[PDB]
Design a protein around this ligand. Structure first.
Ligand SMILES: CC(C)(O)[C@H]1Cc2cc(/C=C3\OC(=O)C(c4ccc5c(c4)C[C@H](C(C)(C)O)O5)=C3O)ccc2O1
Length: 428
């Protein structure tokens, strides 16, 4: 019964060809050619970095990694708190087809070791505060040949920074604007290995390309408008942070980041940066349902709040929307294994407690927990989705992959849901 399979509509703009690296490179080069266009802002230290700076450093890192000897057979780890530098090695690696494994920066040595035993990186990019943990991990994982310090200009404790690493490897006369990213099969070449003991979730370049279609979709994402700023406190090494931020770079937005939540800084940032959209996780929603400071700030520019990371209760969402003077909350539902959200609230068509509608290129159904039958409108069962953002599999764990994804390509989410007469989905 096809009528009970909910399908996303066609994307507003056709899906572009090219790897995720090629698409990011093309967009970022465009924004780079306009001086002063801000890519990231660190709300804590107040420093801005422009698309020109970001584009040039990411391309220099790409070329330096290529000359050092990395290619599609290798992986890198990026282990850092949210920062201005976080996406430099991410973009550089995407530009040359090297898979990136972001490691949670609050993991201890044991958890890092398990994570990197799965991803098996050749080079680790780490912030200064993570260096000791990586050195302890490297003791057990000799495959790590090289450690590069992200948030330093000069060498740091005998290790190269991204800047000195680049100088060591760039050819004379290197031209960042002549550089061309690598081309490769985007279904076969892994872009990210995300953590989900945790497993490693392999995401081909294809899944990011589809994400970039959603991110700028006028219905399922944000319309590309000049001078748009987002406030993001969500960890970049988690899918909600990783894939919203890459999407924002495609859109040329200003991404104001925080690496630690604080109430006054968060609200003052919304006000002073004239933020249009802010990203929260459910426990920060619960926090703002308790906040009374919100009405002391001028939030007249705020258009939306998005919640991701885990389903949000209906009542908490309604409380927060009211405190912020918004008509509703921009919800979505995703898993690490689906790259990002594959149900998203359509712009202007929020419905309290709903996680939204099936995104372009996807299908979703709910199945009876007994009969396995596809269910109709307003009936509760297991949410199952199928589409090109689904992971290629858990790394070196085909049994775990097969337990989650069936022979027809349906991923079984483990969550109970239903959809309504407008094809809005609700998580129960
Ligand atoms: C407008 C706009 C911003 O473009 C769109 C894009 C968008 C995404 C979401 C929600 C999510 O996006 C995500 O990626 C995840 C997610 C990603 C990984 C993941 C989990 C959730 C749960 C699971 C766990 C480990 C439990 O955290 O892993 C979301 O919930 C909500 C609103 C929204 O507006």
């Amino acid at each position: 019964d096809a009528k009970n399979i909910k399908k996303g509509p066609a994307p507003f703009y056709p899906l572009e060809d090219g790897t995720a690296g090629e698409q990011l490179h093309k967009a970022m080069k465009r924004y780079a050619l306009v001086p002063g266009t801000i890519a990231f802002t660190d709300a804590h230290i107040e420093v801005n970095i422009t698309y020109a700076e970001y584009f040039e450093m990411s391309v220099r890192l790409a070329e330096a990694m290529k000359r050092y000897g990395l290619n599609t057979n290798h992986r890198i780890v990026v282990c850092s708190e949210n920062s201005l530098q976080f996406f430099m090695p991410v973009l550089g690696a995407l530009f040359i087809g090297v898979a990136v494994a972001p490691a949670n920066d609050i993991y201890n040595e044991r958890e890092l070791l398990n994570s990197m035993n799965i991803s098996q990186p050749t080079v680790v990019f780490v912030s200064k505060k993570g260096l000791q943990k990586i050195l302890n991990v490297q003791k057990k994982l000799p495959i790590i040949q090289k450690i590069i310090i992200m948030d330093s200009k000069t060498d740091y404790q005998g290790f190269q920074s991204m800047y000195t690493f680049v100088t060591s490897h760039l050819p004379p006369g290197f031209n960042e604007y002549d550089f061309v990213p690598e081309s490769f099969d985007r279904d076969k070449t892994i872009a990210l290995i995300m953590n989900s003991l945790p497993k490693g979730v392999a995401l081909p370049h294809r899944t990011a390309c589809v994400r970039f279609s959603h991110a700028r979709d006028p219905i399922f994402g944000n319309q590309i408008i000049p001078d748009t700023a987002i406030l993001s406190v969500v960890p970049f090494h988690h899918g909600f942070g990783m894939f919203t931020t890459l999407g924002y770079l495609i859109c040329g937005f200003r991404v104001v980041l925080m690496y630690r939540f604080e109430e006054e800084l968060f609200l003052r940032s919304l006000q002073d940066y004239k933020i249009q959209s802010a990203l929260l996780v459910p426990t920060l929603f619960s926090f703002f349902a308790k906040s009374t400071l919100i009405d002391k700030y001028d939030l007249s520019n705020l258009h939306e709040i998005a919640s991701g990371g885990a389903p949000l209760s209906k009542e908490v969402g309604e409380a927060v929307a009211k405190r912020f003077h918004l008509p509703g909350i921009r919800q979505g539902y995703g898993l690490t294994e689906t790259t990002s959200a594959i149900l998203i609230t359509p712009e202007g068509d929020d419905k309290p407690g709903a996680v939204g509608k099936v995104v372009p290129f996807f299908e979703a159904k709910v199945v009876d927990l007994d009969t396995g039958k596809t269910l109709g409108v307003n009936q509760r069962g297991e949410l199952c989705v199928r589409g090109p953002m689904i992971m290629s599999g858990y790394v070196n764990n085909p049994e775990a992959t097969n337990a989650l994804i069936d022979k027809d390509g349906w991923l079984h989410s483990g969550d109970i849901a239903y959809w309504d007469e407008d094809e809005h989905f609700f998580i129960v």
